[PDB]
Ligand binder design. Structure first.
Ligand code: Q6A
Ligand code: NA
Ligand code: ZN
Length: 259
């Protein structure tokens, strides 16, 4: 079994030994150079259709926490933008820092945000998530930056359940959560082909990173930082700095939906 994490001894600089694709040609995240990203008038609008989203459960997996959805039908889907066909929401999670000046995976002109939300979707032409991750167009991840300022009201139900999933392997029922409450006003975005940002680092993702961050309060992000990487009864390792740094862009172009 693999034993990867975010520490000195098991962090991103070590991942290539068990996961050689870590040094591949389409790794994520990347720095978004806003001056070199080109407006693409060919991009179709972006369609976030979350009205029928069915959340089920929240899980501390020892790396982050996942809010899991019922993806047995087209209940919550992402379409349009750079995407061909229909991508079904399966889970969302965050990456965050030990302090407000770091935590995001993507950077914008080298700026790090306090955290980054990833809404993970799979291409329904491949029938299940496990088949989709084996395809270069298998996943679409919608990335949203978090900055610290005013509270995000739609985030508070997530913040309030974290005390019940403090340690690795703990889960709690998490029904009737509306992910529309985590979006900013604007759907302007950057897009590029990349990878999962954690092992197994598969090169199966179309990244869609929104330009407009959401604001969350200091109190909300402080509660993320009280989670634990460790299991119950084990020495406490606070769940902080669960982000991979920017990877080489190589032969890729970042496209902007906006001028
Ligand atoms: C054989 O391949 C795989 C087998 C299982 C999984 C399992 C997942 C879990 C934990 O449910 C999963 O969804 N992983 C995931 C990791 C990073 C991102 S991210 N940061 O790039 O958005 C998004 C999603 C993934 C691949
Ligand atoms: Na299915
Ligand atoms: Zn992620």
């Amino acid at each position: 079994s693999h034993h990867w994490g975010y520490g000195k001894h098991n962090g991103p600089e070590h991942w290539h030994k068990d996961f050689p694709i870590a040094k591949g040609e389409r790794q994520s995240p990347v720095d978004i150079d806003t001056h070199t990203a080109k407006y693409d008038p060919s991009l179709k609008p972006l369609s976030v259709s979350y009205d029928q989203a069915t959340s089920l459960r929240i899980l501390n997996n020892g790396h982050a926490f996942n809010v899991e959805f019922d993806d047995s039908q087209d209940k919550a889907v992402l379409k349009g933008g750079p995407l061909d066909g229909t991508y079904r929401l399966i889970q969302f999670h965050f990456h965050w820092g030990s302090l407000d000046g770091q935590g995001s995976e993507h950077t914008v002109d080298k700026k790090k945000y306090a955290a980054e939300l990833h809404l993970v979707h799979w291409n329904t032409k491949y029938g299940d998530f496990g088949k989709a991750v084996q395809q270069p167009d298998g996943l679409a991840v919608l990335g949203i930056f978090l900055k610290v300022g005013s509270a995000k009201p739609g985030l508070q139900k997530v913040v309030d359940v974290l005390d019940s999933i403090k340690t690795k392997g703990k889960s709690a029922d998490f029904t009737n959560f509306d992910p529309r409450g985590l979006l900013p006003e604007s759907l302007d975005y950057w897009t590029y082909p990349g990878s999962l940002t954690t092992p197994p680092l598969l090169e199966c993702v179309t990244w869609i990173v929104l330009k407009e961050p959401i604001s969350v309060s200091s109190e909300q992000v402080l509660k993320f930082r009280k989670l634990n990487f460790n299991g119950e009864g084990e020495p406490e390792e606070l769940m902080v700095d669960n982000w991979r740094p920017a990877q080489p862009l190589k032969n890729r172009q970042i496209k902007a939906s906006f001028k």
